[PDB]
Amino acid sequence: KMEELFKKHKIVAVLRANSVEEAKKKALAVFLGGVHLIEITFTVPDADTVIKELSFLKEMGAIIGAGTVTSVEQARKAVESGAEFIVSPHLDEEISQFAKEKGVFYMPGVMTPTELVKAMKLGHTILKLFPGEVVGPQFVKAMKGPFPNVKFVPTGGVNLDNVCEWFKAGVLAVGVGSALVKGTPVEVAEKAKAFVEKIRGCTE
Amino acid sequence: KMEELFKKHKIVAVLRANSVEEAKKKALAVFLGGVHLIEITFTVPDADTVIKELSFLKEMGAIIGAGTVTSVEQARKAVESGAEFIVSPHLDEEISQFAKEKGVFYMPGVMTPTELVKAMKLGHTILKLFPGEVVGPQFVKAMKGPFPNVKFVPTGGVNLDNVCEWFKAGVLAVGVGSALVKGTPVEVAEKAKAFVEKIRGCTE
Amino acid sequence: KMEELFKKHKIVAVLRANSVEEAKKKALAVFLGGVHLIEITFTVPDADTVIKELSFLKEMGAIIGAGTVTSVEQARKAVESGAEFIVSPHLDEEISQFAKEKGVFYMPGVMTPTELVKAMKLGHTILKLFPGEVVGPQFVKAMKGPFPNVKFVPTGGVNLDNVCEWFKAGVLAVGVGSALVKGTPVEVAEKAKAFVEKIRGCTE
Amino acid sequence: KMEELFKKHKIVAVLRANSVEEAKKKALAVFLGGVHLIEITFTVPDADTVIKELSFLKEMGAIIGAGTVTSVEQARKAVESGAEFIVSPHLDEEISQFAKEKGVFYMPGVMTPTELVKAMKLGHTILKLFPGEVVGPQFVKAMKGPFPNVKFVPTGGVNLDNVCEWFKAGVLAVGVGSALVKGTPVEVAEKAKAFVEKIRGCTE
């Protein structure tokens, strides 16, 4: 179900903020701009409170998840607060097992073929590629040969100029951080609209 | 308390829409653009449902009221759904009495000196001026002589070009309909920001 | 039935004259020019005699009514003389009740939202807007928001240059006085034809 | 008697001031400039004292009345202080009845055909038109058709440029406020002379 949501929506807002209020305002702004997949990172103060207080957006068709999850304790708080997916920057076997037992989609971060194969052995075929700005679209193209069934969601350095190159490399979706979420709520809503239009114009 | 909110915020979004979903999206858009006073008109389908489902914005500092109220039945539904103020296009003695008994702020609409004096005799000193595009800022200036203590909130034809003329005439606030609320959610948020900046630039 | 006649014919001749003979000649002239709705105003001397003596035009498809009715006494004389509709410059509760008891269409005049709501509470949804030259087409557009089911027939200052602006504002019909009825019988018949052609050219 | 004074003098000074002393100085200035009808508005501090202290000007042929009367209490104080006429911005049934019982001329303010007909039913045929700057000379021309016997005294926005247009529309007299009464006593006397000369030059 989560794979079909990533495939349909093609973009995840990777939300970093300095407060609960700033995070909520930015989550609303990206949703009003047409971004339905919203990742509340655990670098946001009280990220569990932010996820819980955004739960009303699910009735409007938002999908609220947790990102930068680095412990089972954080994964637990995220799920208890109503996170619909979990994202980490790394591969975490304890978070993988916890997410499997809870029936919650987990997207581990990988950077190498060895980490990719470890993630596959834990049952993961949809992988965060992080940092995307270091490995680039070339890594995604290289992995298509030996790993044809693995799908990537790159995070890091995705912007309006390179987003169509990522889709041409064969990514499932993109995780967009500062290029989307940096600025005032109005500028964030305008950037969200521009990303949705740019992605549509190179994936239809 | 409601007078000080009108004086502080200086703008009310007069929200007309064809559905509950459109009304909610536009209410969020004006709030994200910095408009805190939001009038859900009873020409919106299920306007009571819209008011109830927007109640979470009150925790963010939105003030949600009802507009185009033309019966005590509509006034009751609005208050039960959590409306914080009532607005009508006309003077209504039954709505005035009901609002007084409920302890809810009522802003009747007036167009004439006779209707103004009737509204004052019912205890109203803050009056909707409607239609504002017919009577203009000249009516507000004319009423300052005989009625120095009456304050107006004009509705109808208020736009970015004339809003500062309304404040120069001595209005308390402005009710803005189609010039703010018409368009996509993104265009409505941008127009809300432009109205807030324009009003600030001629009232500070 | 009267609503469908106003909707079909789109124009009422508002007939003012200084004698019975002048009124009859002008009523014939507007009818020969294609205007079927003819309002004999009670500012015409012996207006009841004029209505009675024009009764033969009903067999030709003219609809003869009374205008400038300001008392139940005048309303009675108009109906007894065979008036098919009553028009007043104001809202009159006694004329409203009398017209309801007689089963005769009454079109009250209104200028304000408060008078409009009073007229609606008396069962009137088709309202004379008077004076039309003071409130303009902007008033009709403003009333469409809060009062979508109310239909206007403006009277006062309607002419060949502005008649299409009134229809674009969403009026049901127009009441035309001096711009149609002033002049010789020949000039009145030519003006009637010009109004019918102008209205057709912007309402089809 | 008051109708013939309005018809003869054609102008009423509508006197607003911030003190008894300023009001008296301005009343003297307009009288020395040839304006005999002087309306002391109840927005003047101690307006009853001003009327009483101007009573000596009646021996010189000044006609001193009260304006902006909005209660029977104010009407009583005005009459007890020697007001020769009462003016209000609105139609007031209690002031109408009180003025009738006292045998004092009352000129109610009206803005609509409905208020006009209410004023006529209370015995008033000479009406203040207020605010004159909103309804304009076009309203006076429109009322001549349905209400040939009603006479208007417009107040609000009357000045040296438009005063002759008001007389061409068929007003009985004009009420002149800020265009006459604003300035030093010398400037007010010069403006009074200029208004009297301008009115004479378009009404003789």
Numbering used by the authors:
A (entry chain s), B (entry chain H), C (entry chain C), D (entry chain Q): 115 to 318
List passages from the publication reporting this PDB structure.
Mutating the C76A and C100A regions of i301 to alter disulphide bond formation resulted in an optimised mi3 NP with increased particle uniformity and thermostability.
This flexibility is expected because, not only does the symmetry mismatch generate multiple possible conjugation patterns, but CAP255 gp140, the SpyTag–SpyCatcher complex, and mi3 are all connected via flexible linkers. Reconstructing the particle in 3D using a large mask diameter (equal to the box size) and imposing icosahedral symmetry yielded a map with an average resolution of 9.4 Å, composed of an NP surrounded by twelve weaker CAP255 gp140 Env trimer densities. To improve the overall resolution, this 3D reconstruction was manually edited in UCSF Chimera to exclude Env and used to create a mask in Relion 4.01. The fold displays the expected α/β barrel structure and monomers superimposed onto the 2-keto-3-deoxy-phosphogluconate (KDPG) aldolase from Thermotoga maritima, computationally-designed NPs and mi3. The resulting symmetry mismatch between trimeric Env SpyTag and pentameric SpyCatcher means that only twelve copies of Env, instead of the twenty predicted, are present on every NP. Despite this, Env is regularly displayed on the surface of the NP, in keeping with reports that the SpyCatcher mi3 system is resistant to symmetry mismatch.
